[PDB]
Amino acid sequence: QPLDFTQYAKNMRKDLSNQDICLEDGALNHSYFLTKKGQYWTPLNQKALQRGIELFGVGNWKEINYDEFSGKANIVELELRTCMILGINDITEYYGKKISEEEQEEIKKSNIAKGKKENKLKDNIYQK
Amino acid sequence: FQHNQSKSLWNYTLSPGWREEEVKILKSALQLFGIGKWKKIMESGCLPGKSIGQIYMQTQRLLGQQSLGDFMGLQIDLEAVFNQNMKKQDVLRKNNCIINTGDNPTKEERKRRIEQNRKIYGLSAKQIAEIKLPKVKKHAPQYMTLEDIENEKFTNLEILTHLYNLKAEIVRRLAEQG
Amino acid sequence: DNQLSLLLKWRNDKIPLKSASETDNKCKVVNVKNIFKSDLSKYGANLQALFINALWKVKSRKEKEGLNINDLSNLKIPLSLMKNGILFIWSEKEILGQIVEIMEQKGFTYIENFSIMFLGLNKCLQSINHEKSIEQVTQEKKFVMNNLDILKSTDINNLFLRNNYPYFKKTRHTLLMFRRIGDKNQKLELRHQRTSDVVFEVTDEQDPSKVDTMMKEYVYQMIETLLPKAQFIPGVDKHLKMMELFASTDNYRPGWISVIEK
Amino acid sequence: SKKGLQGLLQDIEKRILHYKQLFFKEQNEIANGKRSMVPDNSIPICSDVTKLNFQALIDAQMRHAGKMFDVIMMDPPWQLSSSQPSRGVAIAYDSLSDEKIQNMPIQSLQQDGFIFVWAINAKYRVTIKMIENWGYKLVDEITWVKKTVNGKIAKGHGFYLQHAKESCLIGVKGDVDNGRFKKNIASDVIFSERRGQSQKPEEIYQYINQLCPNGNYLEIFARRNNLHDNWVSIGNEL
DNA sequence: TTTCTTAACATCTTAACTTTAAC
DNA sequence: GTTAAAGTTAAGATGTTAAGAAAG
Ligand SMILES: C[S@@+](CC[C@H](N)C(=O)[O-])C[C@H]1O[C@@H](n2cnc3c(N)ncnc32)[C@H](O)[C@@H]1O
């Protein structure tokens, strides 16, 4: 019987490829291949940034980069990524919340609803 | 341009072409470090973006010939060599560069011509000590150059990082001024 | 579209060179029973360019009465013959590693290879319209070179000559080059990069290994352009510095030591 | 320079907003399932060959495919020039010594198949030797003739002749005469466009598809353009 | 004293880019 | 205001060799 190439590829990538190249299910991670080498935002990086948003101060990316990250991440990268989380293009109004991690999705949904009502969806980021 | 591909392919020069100021800085720099010391030209830093190949070809264009080995580790005046290469008529050139259409170079002829060019076109110690290269600050990103920081080879992330760095530079400049 | 007027342009420029005859001193003719077991030191010395025009009896050629690759190890190229120079040889697919290994055993070192890419004469003629004697092949070559603009609308890949071979169909011939140093103090003069390592040529499908006239001229001109001091200038050089093995009995190159198998 | 500086700051903020919106659109596309150019059935390995555990590759290939690879494509990072050249080619990747390319367990990775190792003119002889001492019989050579976008020959530079082609040496190891491998196919010439530094033609892959249809292949030195279906690819920038 | 790495060395072609004369 | 027609530049998977870092 001929070998199923999709299943064979899934098994090979799950067994012996990197965590960024493959996924938990074994499907190919297109996100790693649509970004430059080294400039990839792993889910671990996003989880670390989400931890540092309310573990540390929003805006003080020196402390978040040195402590929560390994000190090898761009400050502009971190600011842009938390802009993605907050759903807004200006995190200046949200400087230093530091209350709890369990409502970041809540303010994201609030910004999404505001953009939908004010016709400022703009690829899931409310324009301010 | 496709930014998804690997960095090994599509080698570029960042800075595309040679300007008047850049060629004047190269003329000044070849007279202090010497022709051929491209590592020492770039290491001190006066060519923001030019590769070794660009500086090599620009030196060839400056002297009017591609026989750069006659000026290896040697500081001379660029104008006289260009004048003497433009003066002679029984030569064949492409891109205004004189080509050795005769025999291949030899090791002894190299030393003899190096000594001869040092004697003829060489500069004194006063002219060597007179030249001053533009001292660029080492805490400066790609300042201004809105047509060179908006490069297709860069991603959106890299372009935005450059823009934020430059914006912080004007912020620091206004803080110093104010 | 296919730019065949440029890859085949050399056929309109490289004129074949008339032989200088044995009576004149511009060329030397050497007749031996077989070349690979002949002491070639008496036929020349201080050589610079050796061109073994060997046709190999490979299994791909359909019994064309060539040369065994095992007999080349019997060749004797001493330091007296060539001290610092370049050897040019014809190589096939299944004996390429054999040639390289035997040359490395001789004292030579691989430097470069020069490929002739083959365009089918029959395919080109078929695209123009829609056993062959050598004069008919030459006439058809002239016809296809004259009416090449009409051939500009056909893709190159549909004009390539794909000949029988067990693994990948043959479409090229290869001329390997090897270099002998001897003593690094004496340097062999060269004109580098003066012609490309790949050329395009229309050939017949019967035996593309045997390169005809007006194509051996391209290889000759590449050899003389690569080695300028290897040319025989009459009156100021004593001995010929260029030598061909397995040369034609009618075309003696003016400036070469031709060795004929007879 | 104050009013001009204010205008420059306003233009910088406008470009910041524009590129921020572009980045947001790109990453929203990525989050909402943006298919990349590499096909689904590819195995990209981002590892250094001197430190890569090839035994993992062999064990998983036996566990999943049931047979070793039928074709190995190699285009090694030869020592030719540096990343900052003075005169010519500008090879922007880490060179490997010939001993390191020799030390790969290629003989322990294949049982019957084809090596497709690319070579340069300086490393042609050592490529033949590498094929020889890997237990293989060099039998074929495919010349990729580089083509300009207009249709000419993309002539490069050399020391004896102007290099305008690349040689991929193909060797066999064992049983090929069985029905898996097709004989007398394709051609030894790839007249195709030069589309990047050390960028091999796409057509060679189809030639492999014409040689061993529906087979397992491995690319030992591969970049992000070398991923294909049914191809295991290894590299340091994958 | 011997060898190993880096930099710099020329002899070439073609497309892309830039500049310029002409309708 | 375009247009086609030269200059110009970088890019290309060269081998070789003088000049030291490094082991004697
Ligand atoms: C010549 S490139 C392959 C290019 C490919 N043929 C194409 O068509 O794009 C070989 C790659 O091997 C990678 N490489 C270099 N050194 C390596 C090492 N030590 N281990 C693993 N991969 C390495 C580099 O990324 C280099 O670009």
DSSP letter string over chain C?
A: ---HHHHTGGGGT-PPPPP-TTTSSS-EEEEES-STTS-GGGG-SSEEEEEE-PPB--SSSSS---B-GGGGGG----TTTEEEEEEEEEE-STTHHHHHHHHHHHT-EEEEEEEEEEEEHHHHHHHHH----HHHHHHHHHHHHHT-SGGGGS-STTTB--B--SSB-B-EEEEEEEEE-S-TTS-----TT-SBSEEEEEE-SS-TTS--TTTHHHHHHHHHHH-STTS--TTT-SS--EEEES--SS---TTSEEEEE-
Locate tokens 């649509």: which residue? A34
The burial of C90, by beta-carbon neighbours within 10 Å (0-12 exposed, 13-18 middle, 19 or more buried), is given as buried
Inter-chain touch D225–B144, beta carbons under 8 Å: no
Contacts of A85 in chain D (CB under 8 A): none
Q: How far is it, in rounded angstroms, from Cα A74 to Cα C148? A: 59
Q: How far is it, in rounded angstroms, from Cα D26 to Cα D28? A: 6
Q: Which of C151, A34, B114, B156 is nearest to D21 (CA)?
A: B156
Q: How far is it, in rounded angstroms, from Cα C175 to Cα C49? A: 13
C47-52 sheet: strands from edge to edge = C28-32, C257-261, C242-245, C47-52, C82-91, C172-180, C109-120, C198-203
Pairing assessment for the beta strands D165-172 and C257-261 based on DSSP bridges:
unpaired
D226 labelled ligand-binding: yes
**Per the structure block, which two tokens stand in for A50?**
């989400």
Q: How far is it, in rounded angstroms, from Cα D125 to Cα C122? A: 36
Q: Are C259 and C36 in contact (CB under 8 A)?
A: no
Question: How many CB atoms lie under 10 A from the CB of residue A20?
Answer: 17
Resolution in angstroms comes to: 2.9
SS (H, E, C) chain A: CCCCHHHHHHHHHHHHCCCCCCCCCCCCCHHHHCCCCCCCCCHHHHHHHHHHHHHCCCCCHHHHHHHHCCCCCCHHHHHHHHHHHHCECCCCCCCCCCCCCCCHHHHHHHHHHHHHHCCCCCCCCECC
Q: How far is it, in rounded angstroms, from Cα C12 to Cα C6? A: 10
**Per the structure block, which two tokens stand in for B158?**
């890299």
∠ CA C41-C96-C45, nearest 5°, is 15
Our answer on whether A and C touch (3+ beta-carbon pairs < 8 Å) is: no
Residues of A with CB under 8 A from a CB of D: 2-3, 5-6, 8-9, 11-13, 15-18, 20-21, 27-28, 30-31, 33-35, 37, 80, 83-84, 89, 122-125
Question: How many CB atoms lie under 10 A from the CB of residue B148?
Answer: 15
Inter-CA distances, D174 with C78, C170, C184, D55, Å: 39, 22, 43, 21
**Residue A25: HSE in the Cβ half-sphere, 13 Å Cα cutoff:** 4
Q: Which of B9, B157, B164 to mutate to test the interface with A (most CBs of A within 10 A)?
A: B157
State residue D13 phi and psi, 5-degree precision. -65, -40
Q: Which helix (H) or strand (E) holds D218?
A: strand D217-219
Q: Which helix (H) or strand (E) holds D117?
A: strand D114-119
Touching D: C residues 183-202, CB under 8 Å: 190, 192-198
Whether the CA torsion C69, C71, C73, C76 is positive or negative: it is negative
Measured N-to-C along each axis, helices A104-117 and A75-86 cross at an angle, to the nearest 10 degrees, of 70
Q: How far is it, in rounded angstroms, from Cα D204 to Cα D190? A: 7
Q: Which of D54, D195, D218, D236 to mutate to test the pocket of ligand 1 (most atoms within 8 A of CB)?
A: D236
Q: Are D141 and D167 in contact (CB under 8 A)?
A: yes
Inter-CA distances, D97 with B173, D51, D78, D94, Å: 49, 15, 7, 10
3-class secondary-structure state, position B54: helix
Cα D100 → chain centroid? 18
Using a CB–CB cutoff of 8 Å, tell me whether C109 touches chain D. yes
Inter-CA distances, A64 with A58, B103, C192, Å: 9, 65, 59
Give yes or no for residue D192 CB within 6 A of ligand 1. no
Give yes or no for residue D173 CB within 6 A of ligand 1. no
State residue C28 phi and psi, 5-degree precision. -120, 135
3-class secondary-structure state, position B99: coil
The residue type found at B101 is T
**Per the structure block, which two tokens stand in for C42?**
């008496």
Position in ligand 1 atom list of the atom nearest CA D100: 19
Q: How far is it, in rounded angstroms, from Cα D184 to Cα A3? A: 25
Measured N-to-C along each axis, helices B20-30 and B52-63 cross at an angle, to the nearest 10 degrees, of 80
Inter-CA distances, A48 with A45, A95, C12, C128, Å: 5, 18, 70, 69
Q: How far is it, in rounded angstroms, from Cα A127 to Cα B1? A: 28
The burial of C33, by beta-carbon neighbours within 10 Å (0-12 exposed, 13-18 middle, 19 or more buried), is given as exposed
Q: Which of C87, C148, C117 is nearest to C211 (CA)?
A: C117
Nearest CA in chain C to D161: C193
Q: Which of D73, D93, D167 to mutate to test the pocket of ligand 1 (most atoms within 8 A of CB)?
A: D93
Inter-CA distances, B46 with A88, B23, B71, D37, Å: 42, 11, 21, 40
Q: Are B78 and B122 in contact (CB under 8 A)?
A: no
Q: Are C201 and C144 in contact (CB under 8 A)?
A: no
Q: Which of C32, C36, C35 is nearest to C262 (CA)?
A: C32
Give yes or no for residue D21 CB within 6 A of ligand 1. no
What does DSSP assign to residue B3? T
Cα C113 → chain centroid? 11
Q: How far is it, in rounded angstroms, from Cα B26 to Cα B78? A: 10
Q: Which of C58, C110, C168 to mutate to test the interface with D (most CBs of D within 10 A)?
A: C168
End-to-end CA distance of chain C: 47
Q: Which residues contact B128 (CB under 8 A, 6 or more apart)?
A: B31, B32, B75
**Per the structure block, which two tokens stand in for C89?**
């040889």
Q: Which of B24, B4, B22 is nearest to B13 (CA)?
A: B22
Atom 16 of ligand 1, nearest CA residue: D94
Inter-CA distances, D60 with C58, C245, D63, D68, D111, Å: 41, 55, 5, 10, 16
CB-based burial, C167-198: b 16+ in 10 Å, e otherwise: bbbbbbbbbbbbbbeeeeeeebebbebebbbb
3-class secondary-structure state, position D152: coil
3-class secondary-structure state, position D116: strand
Using a CB–CB cutoff of 8 Å, tell me whether C171 touches chain D. yes
D217-219 sheet: strands from edge to edge = D42-46, D231-235, D217-219, D71-74, D114-119, D165-172, D137-147, D189-193
Locate tokens 């390539």: which residue? C160
The residue type found at D63 is R
How far, in Å, is the centroid of ligand 1 from the Cα of D54? 17
Inter-CA distances, D141 with C46, C69, C211, D119, D176, Å: 34, 18, 20, 10, 17
Whether the CA torsion A47, A48, A51, A56 is positive or negative: it is negative
Position in ligand 1 atom list of the atom nearest CA D222: 3
Inter-CA distances, D69 with C68, D110, D115, Å: 35, 6, 10
Atom 18 of ligand 1, nearest CA residue: D48
The burial of D117, by beta-carbon neighbours within 10 Å (0-12 exposed, 13-18 middle, 19 or more buried), is given as buried
Q: Calculate the angstrom distance between C1' of F23 and CA of D49.
A: 29
Locate tokens 């030019």: which residue? B50
